[PDB]
Design a protein around this ligand. Structure first.
Ligand SMILES: [Cl-]
Ligand SMILES: [Cl-]
Ligand SMILES: [Cl-]
Ligand SMILES: [Cl-]
Ligand code: NA
Ligand code: NA
Ligand code: NA
Lengths: 205, 205
């Protein structure tokens, strides 16, 4: 019996990889898949140190100690209290209070940069421990949040908010699968094979 | 403009109160609803100290510094890797690895007690920071978890697990709304009124 230690972003684990995790479990009954979640920085360190076999992390891929594959396109949605007018540019919500998922620095920085590009700013940023909590604050009328569409639409509360994608250069991010630079192990190759049988559906129309 | 500081369990915030939060936001535009999440013990302390106006917490209600209302019935589901035979008693899964939501001690203790009642035990308990992460470990074949049906069925991964309710005396728990003992404030009375227009649907068939 072997061990495949896979790290993942919270959002990816929630709405992108469940089907692949089940398939891998059933395909390789003698491999123990150990799934952990955390921030990209921490996971990358775990992959580099050998504590993780691979991890789903925020792009872009820049660390020379890693190799990787771009896997999931995420559509970044600005989320507001119910019935709010479509938000198409940051000046329209200048000074608004913002709620961010603490563990995903890349999404927070992206949201901030979107404000700054239109010479606007959030009034303040509140770091939150969960997507459900973040969404509940928006539902309650407290401010705005930036959440991938895939994650947003999986949460019941999406019925109680209004959401729109960010404008083109800010609309899409990419979640990568990364591993330690070098020949892939048989287990990782096996995992990528099962994963690929799905990401054709995710990227294709 | 006033402030209503409401604490809530993660699960309750995810799948029980979104509609009520939106209604309260729209009904009282001059009240700022500040929604926080955390473990019951911490929230109760916040209510007692005056940091929170009220909180949704795990029952039963025993602290004499509080008054409260029983609100949501939660059906406790044992969750296993896909296709697993129905689990009706703990001896059937004696020694299994268990995944628990770190913040909800009451649900962890409940699960442990369910094992012990049948002279069984989990092999070990792994504390997890999120329901999605907990569910992903089960999907991956790593063990079992105890999750309220309302929460479970809201997560996409529920399609990749098999789940059954615990047997009668272990099947149902109750989430309470609690506040500091004394006359309720006008805001709390107002919140309870909007809440009551919904919990008839939650409890009734
Ligand atoms: Cl994330
Ligand atoms: Cl990228
Ligand atoms: Cl909870
Ligand atoms: Cl109770
Ligand atoms: Na396994
Ligand atoms: Na408000
Ligand atoms: Na859902």
């Amino acid at each position: 019996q072997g061990l495949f230690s896979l790290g993942s972003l919270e959002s990816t684990a929630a709405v992108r990889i469940p089907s692949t995790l089940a398939h891998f479990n059933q395909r390789y009954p003698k491999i123990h898949l150990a799934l952990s979640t955390g921030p990209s920085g921490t996971m990358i360190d775990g992959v580099l140190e050998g504590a993780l076999s691979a991890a789903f992390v925020d792009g872009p891929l820049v660390h020379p100690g890693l190799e990787g594959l771009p896997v999931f396109p995420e559509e970044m949605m600005i989320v507001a209290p119910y019935g709010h007018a479509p938000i198409t540019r940051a000046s329209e919500v200048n000074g608004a209070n913002v709620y961010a998922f603490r563990a995903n620095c890349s999404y927070r920085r992206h949201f901030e940069s979107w404000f700054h590009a239109d010479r606007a700013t959030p009034g303040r940023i509140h770091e939150m421990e969960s997507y459900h909590g973040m969404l509940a604050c928006v539902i309650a009328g407290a401010g705005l949040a930036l959440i991938p569409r895939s994650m947003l639409e999986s949460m019941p509360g999406h019925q109680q908010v209004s959401a729109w994608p960010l404008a083109e250069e800010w609309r899409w991010l990419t979640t990568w699968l990364v591993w330690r630079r070098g020949a892939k192990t048989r287990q990782l190759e096996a995992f990528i094979a099962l994963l690929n049988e799905d990401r054709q559906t995710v990227v294709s129309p």
